[PDB]
């Protein structure tokens, strides 16, 4: 499983879902113009999954203290 399409601020973030673009040095964009390109991931045949440190409900750690899955970000401290 690969990290999904990069996204956001100079491609320095990664798609965590169709409208959710997070990054260590960026935080998360849930549903902004930053997260428009993640919609492209939906026409890539290869399955992807961003993050490494899982958390929550099949979420990974999107960014510092935030845990995101494909449809939500949550404050998670151990992230």
């Amino acid at each position: 499983l690969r990290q999904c399409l990069p996204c956001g601020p100079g491609g320095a973030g990664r798609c965590f879902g169709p409208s959710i673009c997070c990054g260590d040095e960026l935080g998360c964009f849930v549903g902004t113009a930053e997260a428009l390109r993640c919609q492209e991931e939906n026409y890539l045949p290869s399955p992807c999954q961003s993050g490494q440190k899982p958390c929550g409900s099949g979420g990974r750690c999107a960014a510092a203290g935030i845990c995101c899955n494909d449809e939500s970000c949550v404050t998670e401290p151990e992230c």
């Binding site: 169709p18 991931e41 399955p47 992807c48 999954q49 899955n69």
Partner: peptide, 9 residues
Amino acid sequence: CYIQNCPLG
């Protein structure tokens, strides 16, 4: 696609 909502398998 997102592993969660691909066709997955």
